[PDB]
């Protein structure tokens, strides 16, 4: 029965860890998006409907060490504007709130999709 109690408990933790997990990753992806939006300098060719995926590379202390296009929007100036915006954020020390294994698994190399309209939505400070 002890094996059985364990499953039950394991199923249980896997439920909560995933609801908590999703709130965390949601909150951190939101932070990335907002910080990149604040840095973004929109190019004349940007349009609603575009999407660029960028691979963001970080250290556990939150320093960003690289950003590159993982899937192009089809418009090279928008693509480049997203990569520059990422690099310009500089650091996300908020990452230090993660246990290291979670960092390493999810945020050391992370692909985020950026859209001009969402970057414009969040481009203000305060
Ligand atoms: Zn505005
Ligand atoms: Zn502005």
Swiss-Prot record:
Disulfide bonds: none annotated. It comes from the Bacteria. It is found in: Cell inner membrane. Belongs to the TolA family. Part of the Tol-Pal system, which plays a role in outer membrane invagination during cell division and is important for maintaining outer membrane integrity. The Tol-Pal system is composed of five core proteins: the inner membrane proteins TolA, TolQ and TolR, the periplasmic protein TolB and the outer membrane protein Pal. They form a network linking the inner and outer membranes and the peptidoglycan layer. This is Tol-Pal system protein TolA. The lineage of its organism: Bacteria, Pseudomonadati, Pseudomonadota, Gammaproteobacteria, Pseudomonadales. The chain holds residues 227 to 347 of 347 of the full protein.
